[PDB]
Amino acid sequence: VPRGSTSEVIEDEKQFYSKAKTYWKQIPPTVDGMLGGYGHISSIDINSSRKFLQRFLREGPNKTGTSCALDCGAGIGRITKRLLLPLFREVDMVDITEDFLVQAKTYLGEEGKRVRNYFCCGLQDFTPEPDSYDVIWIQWVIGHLTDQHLAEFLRRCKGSLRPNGIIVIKDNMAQEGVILDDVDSSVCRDLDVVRRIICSAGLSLLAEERQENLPDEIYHVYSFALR
C-alpha cells in the first residue's frame, strides 16, 4: 500500500522539524541553494509562475488585487525579486532561516525597499494578519510541514486573504503516496493527498497546472490556485 499521510512516514515530529532547520542553516544563501543545485531552472520556473498568476489579474468581478503579496518559505527572495515585487506594491516574506532573510536584503537590491515585513518563523508557527494579502505564494516548502500543520497553515492563510485574494501552492508532487526525504527532512506527496489537504482547509481549486520544461529526473511540479 502507498502511504497517504505524514503520520505514516514521520517517526518523530520534533526531529522532523529540527533536522530541516539544521539542514537549511548549512545551505548557501544563493539561488542554487534555494533550488537544490537546479539554480539554472529559475527563469523557466518564474516565467511559468508569471503566466499562471496573470490569469487572476485580468479585469472583472473577481480580479485579484496587486497591493500586497506574501512569499512563504521565501528564502533569499528568488520569487519575491523576479515575480512578486514587479507586480505587487509591497511584499512580505516569511522563512524559518534567518541567514536567508539577512541575505535577501542584499539580493533584492533597491526594489527590496518595498519588502515590508521580514518574518523569521516556521510556517507552522506563523499567523498572517487577517485581510492583508491579495496573493499568498507558497512554493517549494509544503513538504516541510506535517499534514495537520499544512491544513492549519492553509486555514490561517485563508483568513488573511483580501477580497478576491488567492493562495498559490507550487511544489514537488509524488507519482503515488507520501515519500520521506530523510536528508533535508521533508515529504513529497501525490496529487490526491495534496488535494485532500486543500479540501480539509476549506479551500477550492481555481486552477491546477503541471510545470513544463523541467529536467526528466526530478519530481513533477504543479501549481494550484486556491480560494
Binding site: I179, D181, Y219
Partner: peptide
Amino acid sequence: PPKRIA
C-alpha cells in the same frame, strides 16, 4: 527544492 526522484 526541485529534486531527483529517489
